[PDB]
């Protein structure tokens, strides 16, 4: 049993909810959130520049101390960094940029990197600003992850549609 409340069972292990992923974290605390990052842990939108805006820019101010020792990650690839004031642990991952061109056979990869963690707040990965299909991202998500995953849309209309379409 865990405190997330009024998310909408998908699978035995997703659940989803129409609410602000910051809000989310910031009631919650989970042991880890998810960030939709991109391989220079560059902060700037999207759910990316929302949780970094929610810590002060704490998260970039550590991103760039990470960057600076290790390197760019890999689209697909991920990193566990400081949950600030938002969790206790931040996973970084890299889903592909339709809008960079990047290949969507990565998501999958992406999604890997959620099972190492028995519990996760999460974005639904490469969808919104990333440009990817929202539809198709859900699908990898049940498809991929196994440990228990919380699914928080900010977009009210991207929430309903996904719902309604979901296999
Ligand atoms: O600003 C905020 N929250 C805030 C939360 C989410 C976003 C955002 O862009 N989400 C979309 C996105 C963008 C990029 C990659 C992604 O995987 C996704 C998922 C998609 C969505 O969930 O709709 C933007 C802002 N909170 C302030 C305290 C009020």
Sequence with gaps: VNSFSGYLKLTDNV???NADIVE????????????????????????????NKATNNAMQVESDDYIATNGPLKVGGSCVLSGHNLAKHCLHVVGPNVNKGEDIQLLKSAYENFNQ???LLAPLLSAGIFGADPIHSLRVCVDTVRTNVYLAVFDKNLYDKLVSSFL
């Design 15 to 17: 659940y989803i909810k």
């Design 24 to 51: 989310e974290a910031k009631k919650v605390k989970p042991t880890v959130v998810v960030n939709a990052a991109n391989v220079y842990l560059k902060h700037g939108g999207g759910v990316a520049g929302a949780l």
């Design 117 to 119: 963690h028995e519990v």
